[PDB]
Paper text:
The TGF-β ligands are dimers and initiate signal transduction by forming a signalling complex with two copies of a type I receptor and two copies of a type II receptor; all are single-pass transmembrane proteins containing a small extracellular ligand-binding domain (ECD) and an intracellular kinase domain (ICD). Of note, BMPRII is particularly highly expressed in lung vascular endothelial cells, where it mediates the signalling from circulating BMP9 and BMP10.
Here we also solved the crystal structures of BMP10 in a non-covalent complex with its prodomain (Pro:BMP10), which provided a BMP10 conformation in yet another protein interaction context. Two crystal forms were solved to 2.9 Å (crystal form 1, which contains Pro:BMP10 with mutations in the prodomain unstructured regions to promote crystal contacts), and to 3.5 Å (crystal form 2, which contains wild type (WT) Pro:BMP10), respectively. The two structures overlay well in the BMP10 chains and in the prodomain regions that interact with BMP10. The prodomain regions that are not engaged in protein-protein interactions and the α5 helix are truncated or disordered, i.e., not visible in the crystal structures. Importantly, the interface between the prodomain and BMP10 is identical in both structures and comprised of interactions from the extended β-sheet and the α2 helix, conserved with previously reported Pro:BMP9 structures.
Author numbering:
A (entry chain A), C (entry chain B): 321 to 424
B (entry chain C): 79 to 148, 162 to 172, 179 to 226, 247 to 260
D (entry chain D): 81 to 117, 126 to 150, 162 to 172, 181 to 226, 247 to 260
Write the structure that this text describes.
């Protein structure tokens, strides 16, 4: 359906990142799934360019692609890991979880 | 035990108790690398050395730095290199009742090491009348 | 091929925006076309979430979608237009042209 | 499409050596053209969060002094008055910034002025330069 945030759990052993990440074993990162057809609702915080590109695609679908449903705001998580051999802990490891999706 | 139990305890402290957060965003634990030296102990005074492979990026604001050790007065030196030069980093006092781990403020010395090159630094601990390895903790923000 | 900026001219009469936009009659807005397969090059400025989402999709597909090629930095253009009936001129009407693409 | 606003777009699109002092430039028209000498009337409306940088009143003249008042009801309030030159003068601008700034603070959006001279698509218009914060 529409562009919205959907659940998505990432286990660090599945992607091989457990080699340098001590804790946690995983976290809920979510993802943005959906379509961005004109008109774009304002809750998706659509940019001016995303509005026009979606409008040009509505008339001529081969002149321009359609706006994509991507994360627009990311949240950090606490991570204990090994950085170059030193045990490092970041309380806010930025860019890990999705909090807001939107059309861009 | 590859992750020090302190860094593991820090992670569990702030994950379970979300009412508090670290004073800095980035916390590093530098292990001592001199595991073969024996403390010299005259009756009334004990001294032993330490080593640390410290490397903090220059674009970080170092907030605090604690040296974790263990009526006694402790003095922590830094040997800069007879021509040896011993600089007092902190002259603190402790209590004698089940103190277990005692912390010492060596933040000034760490900011000095950040402004200079990432090198190995050698310390000495003076106290007067494996898993317990002293480790140096460095708090810093990503400015 | 890779995620990159492709040309795209937008005529305001084609999309019906010539009713309120006085000048220009159009402009080059560009667009971002391409794919974001792991690994994501650093010139695409991939977020940590875009890196992991592309990595989990590389190993286990159908668990997560692929990172999308969207504009990451937009530029303004000078626009003379009618805002609620008053002749308005903005030297920087923000968000109109694409300057940098990337994976998100 | 006033010639001034069109000429402002073409000025800053070709001469990239300079840019406007403000981001937003609005030009309000005079709606009292059914008169002969003369009064003016403007339907000004500007958001309150915008900082009015400057306001210019553009008049068309065919060395004397010109005074501009704000009608209130006759408790006429002088806004600006200068001695213009008559050497084939065409368009003359006068700063009415402060008059617009208190007009920006609520009040009736409709305003009426009057120009006095001392002993046609040229309809005068009022231009407001404002920044958006
Ligand atoms: C420890 O210091 C040495 C130089 O004395 C350096 O080569 C090495 O990279 C450091 N340790 C680590 C884990 O990087
Ligand atoms: C002129 O001002 C009135 C308020 O007195 C307003 O209702 C009207 O919409 C304005 N004119 C235009 C063209 O917007």
């Amino acid at each position: 359906n529409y562009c919205k945030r959907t659940p998505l759990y990432i286990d660090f052993k599945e992607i091989g990142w457990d080699s340098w990440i001590i804790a946690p074993p995983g976290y809920e990162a979510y993802e943005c799934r959906g379509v961005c057809n004109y008109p774009l609702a304002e809750h998706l915080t659509p940019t001016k360019h995303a509005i026009i590109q979606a409008l040009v695609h509505l008339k001529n679908s081969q002149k321009a692609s359609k706006a994509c449903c991507v994360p627009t705001k990311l949240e950090p998580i606490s991570i204990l890991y090994l950085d170059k051999g030193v045990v490092t802990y970041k309380f806010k490891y930025e860019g890990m979880a999705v909090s807001e999706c939107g059309c861009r | 035990v590859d992750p020090p139990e302190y860094m593991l305890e820090l992670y569990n402290k702030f994950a379970t108790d979300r009412t508090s957060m670290p004073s800095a965003n980035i916390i590093r634990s530098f292990k001592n690398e001199d595991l073969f030296s024996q403390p010299v102990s005259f009756n009334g005074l004990r001294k032993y050395p330490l080593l640390f492979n410290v490397s903090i990026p220059h674009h970080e604001e170092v907030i605090m730095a604690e040296l974790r050790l263990y009526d006694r007065k402790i003095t922590i030196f830094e040997v800069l290199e007879g021509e040896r030069n011993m600089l007092v980093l902190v002259s603190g006092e402790i209590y004698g009742t089940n103190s277990e781990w005692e912390t010492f403020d060596v933040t000034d010395a760490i900011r000095r090491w950040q402004k200079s090159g990432s090198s190995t630094h050698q310390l000495e601990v003076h106290i007067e009348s494996n898993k317990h390895n002293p480790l140096l903790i460095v708090f810093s923000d990503d400015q």
